[PDB]
Design goal:
This is Haloacid dehalogenase-like hydrolase. Helix content is 47%, strand content 12%. By secondary structure, the chain is an alpha/beta fold. Strands 3-2-1-4-5-6 form a six-stranded parallel β-sheet, with helices on both faces. Helix 1 crosses helix 4 and helix 3 crosses helix 4. It binds chloride ion (2 copies) and magnesium ion.
């Protein structure tokens, strides 16, 4: 086999982050009777997402700390509707973090695909997500067992797509570059990052992307395609 090491992103590649996070935010929204402050959950969540997206970029650029990232992203939607209650935002975030890692939703066919690949490849996670969440998410969903090691941006202090985290992931796992494949849903973090260091990439397209500044090594629309690609 050409590849010996498969590096998977976690969120929206293996774990159903968008689905699981929407469910969790809605549960916490309802718990705190947020219809008092917003027209609907979607009024809340669209505001939350707009700022959260901006914030994760600032974080990757070293413009906010993880702590400031978290403080701002749960407070932003409340202050956007005139609620200046920072303590309420903090209680909300505590409940979000208590619940999110308990969710078990995976991307389609993930368990089957991982069970198929595990005997034949070293399987790794390469993720920017929080150490106190990532392995818990994986256990809850029953997929932690497939992965030999989890490599986090927090291990190094550098987020995808910066090159350092990819070179670190290779060394940390005794992996040769030419024997490694990055599999992920983020064009900007996973595919651009891996391409940047000369590592092959399989772009898992769940955003209906049609425009490519460069072509990924492989372009798949289902994790099932991995079983065919890497048979
Ligand atoms: Cl990530
Ligand atoms: Cl597990
Ligand atoms: Mg992802």
């Amino acid at each position: 086999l050409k590849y010996k090491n498969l590096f998977f992103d976690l969120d929206d590649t293996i774990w159903a982050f968008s689905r699981n996070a929407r469910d969790t935010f809605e549960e916490v929204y309802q718990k705190y009777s947020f219809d008092r402050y917003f027209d609907s959950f979607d009024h809340y969540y669209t505001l939350y997402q707009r700022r959260n997206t901006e914030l994760w970029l600032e974080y990757g650029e070293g413009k906010v700390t993880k702590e400031e990232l978290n403080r701002q992203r749960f407070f932003y939607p409340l202050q956007a509707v005139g609620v200046e209650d920072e303590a309420l935002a903090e209680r909300f975030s505590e409940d979000f973090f208590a619940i999110i890692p308990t969710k078990s939703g995976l991307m389609p066919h993930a368990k089957e695909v991982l069970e198929y690949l595990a005997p034949q490849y070293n399987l790794y996670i390469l993720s920017n997500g929080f150490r106190e969440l990532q392995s818990r998410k994986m256990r809850s969903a029953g997929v932690d067992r497939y992965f030999k090691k989890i490599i986090l941006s927090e291990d190094l202090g550098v987020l995808k797509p910066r090159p350092e985290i990819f070179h670190f992931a290779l060394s940390a796992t005794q992996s040769e570059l030419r024997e490694s494949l990055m599999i992920g849903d983020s064009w900007e973090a996973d595919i651009t990052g891996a391409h940047g260091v000369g590592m092959h990439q399989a772009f898992y397209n769940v955003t209906e992307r049609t425009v490519f500044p460069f072509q990924p090594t492989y372009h798949i629309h289902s994790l099932k395609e991995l079983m065919n690609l890497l048979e």
